[PDB]
Amino acid sequence: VVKLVTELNKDTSKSALPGSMVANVVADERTNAVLVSGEPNSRQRIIAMIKQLDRQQAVQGNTKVIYLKYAKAADLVEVLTGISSKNIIIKAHGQTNALIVTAAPDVMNDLERVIAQLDIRRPQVLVEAIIAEVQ
């Protein structure tokens, strides 16, 4: 968050004002809280953003785990390596026969469609041959 606060409220073409009457922000990773210091009409803004930033997630989509039904996943990992390449890292389990997708959290739909077109019951064929001769 703080790693992303001094990018949304940092500066302007001309300073709002001298170094005072404006707050600085740091944080420790230890208690999972954040530090502010400043003036009683400066900090309130900071608390405003964190109130807005501190939202709840509908569903975490950073990583979602799918379960494939008819194809194995060993072949699929290697066949599927390069849609959009930071990159898309596909991992396959093999011990529950399910695969993961810890890649883009916004275009995964381009993967759900393709795996849905890639998991399909397969028909099998019966072959018999016959031979015969006389001597």
């Binding site: 039904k69 008819y70 194995k72 026969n97």
Partner: protein, 39 residues
């Protein structure tokens, strides 16, 4: 049983070597890459 041939020789087996690999897909279906011989 198991019996040795001269290839100094090695071990050779003669019987019913049935091995498989089961993959459960649907609620009810399976996949069997089986191989075996009755020798």
């Amino acid at each position: 049983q198991e019996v040795p041939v001269l290839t100094t020789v090695e071990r050779k087996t003669v019987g019913i070597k049935l091995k498989v690999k089961p993959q459960i897909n649907e609620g009810d279906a399976v996949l069997l890459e089986i191989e075996q011989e009755v020798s």
